[PDB]
């Protein structure tokens, strides 16, 4: 539960991401992998990338980052009513990609780190608090979906 005002700050900063999704998606995956390298292992496509420069050159990394932020923007615009976009996500990440719920926490933080690095004037104390509650709400619903499918990592 976010107030309408909070959803509004969230969608306003999200507008910055939509003017460049692939660029923000790439920076988010490089941050996640620089901050939690163990997350790099779930991506078979990227197991062989050895440096930030190889990651920056990868066009597959850019497309996967693009896909991740385009699927996240779609869930945020639902403003809490994303049960339906959430289910297939929870089914594939739980059962096929095998993403433990703590990694959802690692990507939430890389997202906030890239918004803070890229848009400091627009990502003030309030947009920051609205944005972390929104990613937290999303994390929590996903874990709830993970525990009903019989998983939870
Ligand atoms: C921000 C939360 C996330 C969103 C919205 C998201 C969304 C997606 C989407 C839409 C896809 C493509 C279709 C599908 O397989 O379901 C995908 C693929 C994938 N996701 Fe995520 N995901 C998220 C978090 C994560 C995390 C934290 C990891 C690993 C640490 C991850 C690993 C993967 C992998 C390995 C794939 C397959 C990529 C490929 O084609 O190689 N996802 N994700």
Curated annotation (Swiss-Prot):
It comes from the Eukaryota. O2 binds at residue 64. The modification Phosphoserine is found at residue 3. PANTHER family: MYOGLOBIN. Its EC number is 1.7.-.-, 1.11.1.-. It is found in: Cytoplasm, Sarcoplasm. The keyword Disulfide bond does not apply. Monomeric. CDD domains: Mb. It holds the Pfam family Globin. Nitrite binds at residue 64. Gene3D superfamilies: 6.10.140.2100, 6.10.140.2110. One of its GO terms (biological process) is oxygen transport. This is Myoglobin. The modification Phosphothreonine is found at residue 67. The gene is MB. GO terms for cellular component: sarcoplasm. Keywords: Cytoplasm, Heme, Iron, Metal-binding, Muscle protein, Oxidoreductase, Oxygen transport, Phosphoprotein, Transport. Residues 1-147 form the Globin domain. Belongs to the globin family. Monomeric heme protein which primary function is to store oxygen and facilitate its diffusion within muscle tissues. Reversibly binds oxygen through a pentacoordinated heme iron and enables its timely and efficient release as needed during periods of heightened demand. Depending on the oxidative conditions of tissues and cells, and in addition to its ability to bind oxygen, it also has a nitrite reductase activity whereby it regulates the production of bioactive nitric oxide. GO terms for molecular function: heme binding; metal ion binding; nitrite reductase activity; oxygen binding; oxygen carrier activity; peroxidase activity. Its main location: cytoplasm. It is an enzyme of class 1 (oxidoreductase). Heme b binds at residue 93. It catalyses: Fe(III)-heme b-[protein] + nitric oxide + H2O = Fe(II)-heme b-[protein] + nitrite + 2 H(+); H2O2 + AH2 = A + 2 H2O.
């Amino acid at each position: 539960g976010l107030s309408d005002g909070e959803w509004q700050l969230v969608l306003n900063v999200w507008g910055k991401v939509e003017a460049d999704v692939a660029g923000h998606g790439q920076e988010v995956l490089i941050r996640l992998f620089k901050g939690h390298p163990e997350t790099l292992e779930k991506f078979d496509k990227f197991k062989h990338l050895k440096s930030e420069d190889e990651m920056k050159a990868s066009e597959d990394l850019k497309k996967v980052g693009n896909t991740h932020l385009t699927a996240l923007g779609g869930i945020l615009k639902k403003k809490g009513h994303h049960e339906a976009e959430l289910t297939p996500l929870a089914q594939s990440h739980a059962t096929k990609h095998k993403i433990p719920v703590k990694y959802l926490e690692f990507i939430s933080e890389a997202i906030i780190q890239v918004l803070q690095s890229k848009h400091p004037g627009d990502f003030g104390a309030d947009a920051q608090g609205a944005m972390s509650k929104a990613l937290e709400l999303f994390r929590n619903d996903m874990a709830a979906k993970y525990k009903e499918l019989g998983f939870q990592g």
